[PDB]
PDB file of all heavy atoms in Angstrom:
ATOM      1  N   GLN A  24     -13.102   9.002  10.702  1.00 57.48           N
ATOM      2  CA  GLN A  24     -12.869  10.400  11.042  1.00 57.48           C
ATOM      3  C   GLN A  24     -11.479  10.604  10.468  1.00 57.48           C
ATOM      4  O   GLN A  24     -10.539   9.904  10.844  1.00 57.48           O
ATOM      5  CB  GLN A  24     -12.857  10.622  12.554  1.00 57.48           C
ATOM      6  CG  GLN A  24     -14.242  10.720  13.191  1.00 57.48           C
ATOM      7  CD  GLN A  24     -14.183  11.047  14.679  1.00 57.48           C
ATOM      8  OE1 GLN A  24     -14.677  10.282  15.511  1.00 57.48           O
ATOM      9  NE2 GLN A  24     -13.578  12.185  15.022  1.00 57.48           N
ATOM     10  N   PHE A  26      -7.830  12.501   9.433  1.00 56.46           N
ATOM     11  CA  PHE A  26      -6.763  13.269  10.106  1.00 56.46           C
ATOM     12  C   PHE A  26      -5.503  13.370   9.243  1.00 56.46           C
ATOM     13  O   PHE A  26      -5.154  12.418   8.534  1.00 56.46           O
ATOM     14  CB  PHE A  26      -6.338  12.600  11.431  1.00 56.46           C
ATOM     15  CG  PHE A  26      -7.387  12.631  12.502  1.00 56.46           C
ATOM     16  CD1 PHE A  26      -8.252  11.567  12.673  1.00 56.46           C
ATOM     17  CD2 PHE A  26      -7.543  13.743  13.309  1.00 56.46           C
ATOM     18  CE1 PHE A  26      -9.250  11.616  13.620  1.00 56.46           C
ATOM     19  CE2 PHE A  26      -8.547  13.803  14.268  1.00 56.46           C
ATOM     20  CZ  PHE A  26      -9.401  12.739  14.422  1.00 56.46           C
ATOM     21  N   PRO A  40      -5.412  14.812  17.851  1.00 43.40           N
ATOM     22  CA  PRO A  40      -6.064  15.666  18.847  1.00 43.40           C
ATOM     23  C   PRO A  40      -7.399  15.092  19.317  1.00 43.40           C
ATOM     24  O   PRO A  40      -8.137  14.498  18.540  1.00 43.40           O
ATOM     25  CB  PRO A  40      -6.222  16.985  18.107  1.00 43.40           C
ATOM     26  CG  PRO A  40      -5.015  17.003  17.224  1.00 43.40           C
ATOM     27  CD  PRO A  40      -5.010  15.601  16.674  1.00 43.40           C
ATOM     28  N   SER A  41      -7.703  15.274  20.596  1.00 42.44           N
ATOM     29  CA  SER A  41      -8.940  14.765  21.169  1.00 42.44           C
ATOM     30  C   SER A  41     -10.067  15.793  21.270  1.00 42.44           C
ATOM     31  O   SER A  41      -9.829  16.979  21.494  1.00 42.44           O
ATOM     32  CB  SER A  41      -8.667  14.202  22.565  1.00 42.44           C
ATOM     33  OG  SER A  41      -9.861  13.701  23.137  1.00 42.44           O
ATOM     34  N   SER A  42     -11.302  15.330  21.106  1.00 42.83           N
ATOM     35  CA  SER A  42     -12.449  16.218  21.232  1.00 42.83           C
ATOM     36  C   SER A  42     -12.490  16.655  22.700  1.00 42.83           C
ATOM     37  O   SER A  42     -13.171  17.608  23.069  1.00 42.83           O
ATOM     38  CB  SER A  42     -13.738  15.471  20.885  1.00 42.83           C
ATOM     39  OG  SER A  42     -13.992  14.417  21.802  1.00 42.83           O
ATOM     40  N   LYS A  43     -11.754  15.934  23.537  1.00 40.42           N
ATOM     41  CA  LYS A  43     -11.707  16.235  24.953  1.00 40.42           C
ATOM     42  C   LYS A  43     -10.592  17.234  25.284  1.00 40.42           C
ATOM     43  O   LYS A  43     -10.288  17.477  26.452  1.00 40.42           O
ATOM     44  CB  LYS A  43     -11.536  14.932  25.745  1.00 40.42           C
ATOM     45  CG  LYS A  43     -12.741  13.981  25.641  1.00 40.42           C
ATOM     46  CD  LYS A  43     -12.551  12.706  26.477  1.00 40.42           C
ATOM     47  CE  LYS A  43     -12.168  13.037  27.939  1.00 40.42           C
ATOM     48  NZ  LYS A  43     -11.918  11.843  28.826  1.00 40.42           N
ATOM     49  N   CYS A  44      -9.986  17.819  24.257  1.00 41.67           N
ATOM     50  CA  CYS A  44      -8.927  18.795  24.491  1.00 41.67           C
ATOM     51  C   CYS A  44      -9.550  20.148  24.746  1.00 41.67           C
ATOM     52  O   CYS A  44     -10.268  20.671  23.892  1.00 41.67           O
ATOM     53  CB  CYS A  44      -7.994  18.898  23.285  1.00 41.67           C
ATOM     54  SG  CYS A  44      -6.817  20.297  23.372  1.00 41.67           S
ATOM     55  N   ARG A  46     -10.645  23.787  24.837  1.00 39.44           N
ATOM     56  CA  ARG A  46     -10.520  24.775  23.779  1.00 39.44           C
ATOM     57  C   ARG A  46      -9.603  25.915  24.193  1.00 39.44           C
ATOM     58  O   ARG A  46      -9.300  26.795  23.385  1.00 39.44           O
ATOM     59  CB  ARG A  46     -11.890  25.306  23.354  1.00 39.44           C
ATOM     60  CG  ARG A  46     -12.765  24.218  22.741  1.00 39.44           C
ATOM     61  CD  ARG A  46     -11.923  23.296  21.866  1.00 39.44           C
ATOM     62  NE  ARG A  46     -12.423  21.923  21.887  1.00 39.44           N
ATOM     63  CZ  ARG A  46     -13.343  21.450  21.053  1.00 39.44           C
ATOM     64  NH1 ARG A  46     -13.860  22.241  20.118  1.00 39.44           N
ATOM     65  NH2 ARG A  46     -13.756  20.197  21.162  1.00 39.44           N
ATOM     66  N   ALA A  50      -4.454  25.488  19.928  1.00 42.76           N
ATOM     67  CA  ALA A  50      -3.996  24.521  18.932  1.00 42.76           C
ATOM     68  C   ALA A  50      -5.079  23.474  18.640  1.00 42.76           C
ATOM     69  O   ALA A  50      -5.164  22.940  17.531  1.00 42.76           O
ATOM     70  CB  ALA A  50      -2.719  23.839  19.402  1.00 42.76           C
ATOM     71  N   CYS A  51      -5.913  23.181  19.628  1.00 44.96           N
ATOM     72  CA  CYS A  51      -6.979  22.215  19.422  1.00 44.96           C
ATOM     73  C   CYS A  51      -8.133  22.847  18.674  1.00 44.96           C
ATOM     74  O   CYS A  51      -8.946  22.153  18.065  1.00 44.96           O
ATOM     75  CB  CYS A  51      -7.458  21.665  20.751  1.00 44.96           C
ATOM     76  SG  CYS A  51      -6.233  20.531  21.441  1.00 44.96           S
ATOM     77  N   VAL A  52      -8.207  24.172  18.728  1.00 45.70           N
ATOM     78  CA  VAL A  52      -9.242  24.901  18.023  1.00 45.70           C
ATOM     79  C   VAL A  52      -8.931  24.920  16.521  1.00 45.70           C
ATOM     80  O   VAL A  52      -9.841  25.060  15.712  1.00 45.70           O
ATOM     81  CB  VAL A  52      -9.352  26.349  18.567  1.00 45.70           C
ATOM     82  CG1 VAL A  52     -10.219  27.219  17.643  1.00 45.70           C
ATOM     83  CG2 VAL A  52      -9.941  26.317  19.969  1.00 45.70           C
ATOM     84  N   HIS A  54      -7.299  22.300  14.720  1.00 49.99           N
ATOM     85  CA  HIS A  54      -7.059  20.975  14.143  1.00 49.99           C
ATOM     86  C   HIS A  54      -8.263  20.035  14.229  1.00 49.99           C
ATOM     87  O   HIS A  54      -9.219  20.289  14.965  1.00 49.99           O
ATOM     88  CB  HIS A  54      -5.861  20.305  14.808  1.00 49.99           C
ATOM     89  CG  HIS A  54      -4.554  20.938  14.460  1.00 49.99           C
ATOM     90  ND1 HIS A  54      -4.058  22.037  15.126  1.00 49.99           N
ATOM     91  CD2 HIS A  54      -3.650  20.641  13.494  1.00 49.99           C
ATOM     92  CE1 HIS A  54      -2.904  22.390  14.585  1.00 49.99           C
ATOM     93  NE2 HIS A  54      -2.635  21.559  13.593  1.00 49.99           N
ATOM     94  N   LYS A  55      -8.218  18.950  13.462  1.00 50.24           N
ATOM     95  CA  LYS A  55      -9.300  17.976  13.492  1.00 50.24           C
ATOM     96  C   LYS A  55      -9.240  17.225  14.832  1.00 50.24           C
ATOM     97  O   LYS A  55      -8.160  16.792  15.259  1.00 50.24           O
ATOM     98  CB  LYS A  55      -9.159  16.996  12.329  1.00 50.24           C
ATOM     99  CG  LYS A  55     -10.254  15.937  12.276  1.00 50.24           C
ATOM    100  CD  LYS A  55     -11.617  16.545  11.978  1.00 50.24           C
ATOM    101  CE  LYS A  55     -11.903  16.511  10.497  1.00 50.24           C
ATOM    102  NZ  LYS A  55     -11.913  15.113   9.957  1.00 50.24           N
ATOM    103  N   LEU A  56     -10.387  17.095  15.503  1.00 52.01           N
ATOM    104  CA  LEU A  56     -10.443  16.406  16.797  1.00 52.01           C
ATOM    105  C   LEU A  56     -11.167  15.063  16.703  1.00 52.01           C
ATOM    106  O   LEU A  56     -12.197  14.953  16.032  1.00 52.01           O
ATOM    107  CB  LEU A  56     -11.149  17.284  17.832  1.00 52.01           C
ATOM    108  CG  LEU A  56     -10.694  18.745  17.980  1.00 52.01           C
ATOM    109  CD1 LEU A  56     -11.418  19.385  19.174  1.00 52.01           C
ATOM    110  CD2 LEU A  56      -9.190  18.823  18.196  1.00 52.01           C
ATOM    111  N   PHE A  57     -10.632  14.042  17.372  1.00 54.55           N
ATOM    112  CA  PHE A  57     -11.252  12.722  17.358  1.00 54.55           C
ATOM    113  C   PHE A  57     -12.325  12.616  18.425  1.00 54.55           C
ATOM    114  O   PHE A  57     -12.052  12.780  19.616  1.00 54.55           O
ATOM    115  CB  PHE A  57     -10.218  11.613  17.580  1.00 54.55           C
ATOM    116  CG  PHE A  57     -10.827  10.246  17.770  1.00 54.55           C
ATOM    117  CD1 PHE A  57     -11.308   9.524  16.681  1.00 54.55           C
ATOM    118  CD2 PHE A  57     -10.935   9.685  19.038  1.00 54.55           C
ATOM    119  CE1 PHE A  57     -11.888   8.260  16.851  1.00 54.55           C
ATOM    120  CE2 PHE A  57     -11.509   8.428  19.219  1.00 54.55           C
ATOM    121  CZ  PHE A  57     -11.986   7.714  18.121  1.00 54.55           C
ATOM    122  N   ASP A  58     -13.550  12.342  17.995  1.00 55.63           N
ATOM    123  CA  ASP A  58     -14.657  12.213  18.924  1.00 55.63           C
ATOM    124  C   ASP A  58     -15.044  10.746  19.065  1.00 55.63           C
ATOM    125  O   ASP A  58     -15.649  10.154  18.173  1.00 55.63           O
ATOM    126  CB  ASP A  58     -15.857  13.013  18.432  1.00 55.63           C
ATOM    127  CG  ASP A  58     -16.751  13.458  19.563  1.00 55.63           C
ATOM    128  OD1 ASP A  58     -16.883  12.704  20.559  1.00 55.63           O
ATOM    129  OD2 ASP A  58     -17.329  14.560  19.456  1.00 55.63           O
TER     130      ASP A  58
END
Side-chain angles (χ1 to χ4, degrees):
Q24 280 184 239
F26 292 94
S41 180
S42 64
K43 294 182 52 182
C44 170
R46 296 321 147 89
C51 287
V52 168
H54 290 85
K55 180 66 94 60
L56 310 186
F57 172 77
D58 207 326

